[PDB]
């Protein structure tokens, strides 16, 4: 799914203790509130753990 | 699961809120499981955060 044009607030998501894995390899969550994207590309599956 | 907050250079509510560690952190963690020392069917809620 591409996500544009919109203001994302990650700090929920991120304070969403649900979540098991989080991991972000070119940015940091807490930067991610002070940063603005180009275009962004939520892809969804699952799998085996 | 907060067992890996622990480690320096970590984030999170633990490491935001409650108790943080150093980035140039020297020494040694040890850890243990204890819930048959400190846990209870009821619910043991003696440990808040």
Known sequence: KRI???????????????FSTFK?????????????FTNVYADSFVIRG | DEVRQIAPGQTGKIADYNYKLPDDFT??????????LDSKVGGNYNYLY
């Open chain 2, 27 to 36: 020494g040694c963690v040890i850890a243990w499981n204890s819930n048959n």
């Open chain 1, 4 to 18: 544009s044009n919109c203001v994302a607030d990650y700090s929920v998501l991120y304070n969403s203790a649900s």
């Open chain 1, 24 to 36: 972000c390899y070119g940015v940091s969550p807490t930067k991610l509130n002070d940063l603005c």
